[PDB]
Design an enzyme around this catalytic site. Structure first.
Site, PDB file in Angstrom:
ATOM      1  N   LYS A  67     -56.699  -3.791 -52.902  1.00 53.81           N
ATOM      2  CA  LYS A  67     -57.942  -3.612 -53.647  1.00 53.81           C
ATOM      3  C   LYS A  67     -58.392  -4.901 -54.319  1.00 53.81           C
ATOM      4  O   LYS A  67     -59.577  -5.028 -54.654  1.00 53.81           O
ATOM      5  CB  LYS A  67     -57.751  -2.530 -54.711  1.00 53.81           C
ATOM      6  CG  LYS A  67     -57.560  -1.127 -54.122  1.00 53.81           C
ATOM      7  CD  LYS A  67     -57.249  -0.100 -55.238  1.00 53.81           C
ATOM      8  CE  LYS A  67     -57.087   1.338 -54.676  1.00 53.81           C
ATOM      9  NZ  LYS A  67     -55.934   1.540 -53.752  1.00 53.81           N
ATOM     10  N   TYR A 150     -58.284   7.116 -60.910  1.00 55.43           N
ATOM     11  CA  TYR A 150     -57.896   6.180 -59.858  1.00 55.43           C
ATOM     12  C   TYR A 150     -58.029   6.807 -58.467  1.00 55.43           C
ATOM     13  O   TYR A 150     -57.556   7.926 -58.227  1.00 55.43           O
ATOM     14  CB  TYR A 150     -56.461   5.743 -60.125  1.00 55.43           C
ATOM     15  CG  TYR A 150     -55.949   4.681 -59.203  1.00 55.43           C
ATOM     16  CD1 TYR A 150     -56.555   3.421 -59.169  1.00 55.43           C
ATOM     17  CD2 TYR A 150     -54.826   4.898 -58.408  1.00 55.43           C
ATOM     18  CE1 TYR A 150     -56.089   2.429 -58.360  1.00 55.43           C
ATOM     19  CE2 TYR A 150     -54.346   3.901 -57.588  1.00 55.43           C
ATOM     20  CZ  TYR A 150     -54.989   2.665 -57.575  1.00 55.43           C
ATOM     21  OH  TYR A 150     -54.523   1.657 -56.776  1.00 55.43           O
ATOM     22  N   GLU A 272     -56.124  -4.925 -63.158  1.00 57.84           N
ATOM     23  CA  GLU A 272     -55.949  -4.448 -64.524  1.00 57.84           C
ATOM     24  C   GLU A 272     -55.690  -5.643 -65.430  1.00 57.84           C
ATOM     25  O   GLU A 272     -55.025  -6.608 -65.029  1.00 57.84           O
ATOM     26  CB  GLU A 272     -54.742  -3.524 -64.579  1.00 57.84           C
ATOM     27  CG  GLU A 272     -54.964  -2.279 -63.758  1.00 57.84           C
ATOM     28  CD  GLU A 272     -53.697  -1.475 -63.506  1.00 57.84           C
ATOM     29  OE1 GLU A 272     -52.645  -1.753 -64.104  1.00 57.84           O
ATOM     30  OE2 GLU A 272     -53.787  -0.534 -62.714  1.00 57.84           O
ATOM     31  N   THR A 313     -50.092  -3.160 -59.248  1.00 53.82           N
ATOM     32  CA  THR A 313     -49.064  -2.631 -58.360  1.00 53.82           C
ATOM     33  C   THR A 313     -49.698  -2.114 -57.070  1.00 53.82           C
ATOM     34  O   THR A 313     -50.880  -1.756 -57.011  1.00 53.82           O
ATOM     35  CB  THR A 313     -48.308  -1.466 -59.008  1.00 53.82           C
ATOM     36  OG1 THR A 313     -49.228  -0.403 -59.297  1.00 53.82           O
ATOM     37  CG2 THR A 313     -47.553  -1.899 -60.269  1.00 53.82           C
ATOM     38  N   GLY A 314     -48.879  -2.009 -56.031  1.00 57.25           N
ATOM     39  CA  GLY A 314     -49.347  -1.357 -54.826  1.00 57.25           C
ATOM     40  C   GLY A 314     -48.161  -0.892 -54.023  1.00 57.25           C
ATOM     41  O   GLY A 314     -47.086  -1.498 -54.076  1.00 57.25           O
TER      42      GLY A 314
END
Length: 359
Positions: A67, A150, A272, A313-314
């Site tokens: 993203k 989200y 973020e 994070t992912g």
């Protein structure tokens, strides 16, 4: 009397290496960049059955860290005048004009505030036609712009609109425009046959080898694969936007601009954002079930933090990723694994390393 490269390797050994055994993780790459010097640490195997060691060429799935690239593509299109974040999606995807989703604007899509979009598309939404039908049948729930939930379909739709405004498929937006502009030469939406030998296996919770499967709007939501050197370069770009031409520099700055808050978390574009120094709990809260899985009222930014940090994070079914950077400390860190480990462990280990490295 210990060189800095060894001090960083020791800290990574102390904080990241124990995770391999704790979570039965086959392979990991951890990179730090500080003051424009890069430090790369590789552990374990990118393929267990091939006994192939993780290395600078290993390609990992970024999951939701993808993203960040979608957000950068949006910042680029906006700064080239191809979109305004106040536009609605029907301006570009004409089949959505005069539908309820055409009341949501692009920034609200990119930052998850449509008020009725879940984490994932429904399982049965697969084809292009099914995706369009899904958006045509969309109806509001909560007041548009008030609640953050989200959502892959939300930022996926943003990504599709960004691509439409640039007259190319999204995959080509990244591989022909954004990745070359950021100097990333081993990052892909679709890994070519000639590089599959470098594509790690992911590993599921049974340690069985897997890779990501196709899905609706996968590319903008979680579709990128990259190497540790490329991800260190991406952190470098975020640490030094003044090193890119005006359009890409502004695109990067757009991703750094906080848009609203949920408690101590600032929602930027993709990233973020947090006031720095951030307590460990602040960083953990951003990945709490309350924030990730539930809707939350958004509030306007009150403190615009002068000194700040960013992270994301992912995960995919078989991979974990964490990226974090601190502009005024000229430092960042990337973790890539070919098995998921809890988000809290990634955040904790990065926090310990980054706080202990000598300035």
């Amino acid at each position: 009397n210990t060189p800095k490269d060894q001090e960083i390797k020791k800290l990574v050994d102390q904080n990241f290496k124990p995770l391999l055994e704790k979570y039965d993780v086959p392979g990991m790459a951890v990179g730090v960049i500080q003051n424009n010097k890069k430090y790369e640490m590789y552990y374990g195997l990118q393929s267990v059955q091939d006994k192939k060691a993780v290395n600078s060429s290993t390609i990992f799935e970024l999951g939701s860290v993808s993203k960040l690239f979608t957000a950068t593509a949006g910042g680029y299109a906006k700064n080239k005048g191809k979109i305004s974040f106040d536009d609605t999606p029907g301006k570009y995807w004409k089949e959505l004009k005069n539908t309820p989703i055409d009341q949501v604007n692009l920034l609200q899509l990119a930052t998850y505030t449509s008020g009725n979009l879940a984490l994932q598309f429904p399982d049965e939404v697969k084809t292009d036609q099914q995706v369009l039908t899904f958006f045509k049948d969309w109806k509001p729930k909560n007041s548009i712009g008030e609640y953050r939930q989200y959502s892959n379909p939300s930022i996926g739709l943003f990504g599709k609109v960004v691509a439409l405004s640039m007259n190319k498929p999204f995959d080509q937006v990244l591989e022909k425009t954004i990745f070359p502009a950021l100097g990333l030469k081993h990052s892909y939406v679709n890994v070519p046959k000639t590089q599959m030998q470098n594509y790690a296996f992911g590993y599921n919770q049974e340690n069985q080898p897997i890779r990501v499967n196709p899905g609706p709007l996968d590319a903008p939501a979680y579709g990128v694969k990259s190497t540790l050197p490329d991800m260190l370069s991406f952190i470098h770009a975020n640490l030094n936007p003044q090193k890119y031409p005006a359009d890409i520099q502004r695109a990067i700055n757009e991703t750094h601009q906080g848009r609203y808050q949920v408690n101590t978390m600032y929602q930027a574009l993709g990233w973020e954002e947090f006031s720095y120094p951030a307590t460990l709990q602040t960083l953990l809260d951003s990945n709490s079930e309350q924030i990730v899985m539930k809707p939350n009222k958004v509030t306007a930014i009150s403190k615009e933090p002068s000194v700040k940090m960013y992270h994301k994070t992912g995960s995919t079914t078989g991979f974990g990723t964490y990226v974090v950077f601190i502009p005024k400390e000229n430092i960042g860190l990337v973790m890539l694994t070919n098995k998921r480990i809890p988000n809290e462990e990634r955040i904790k280990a990065a926090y310990a390393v980054l706080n202990a490295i000598k300035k």
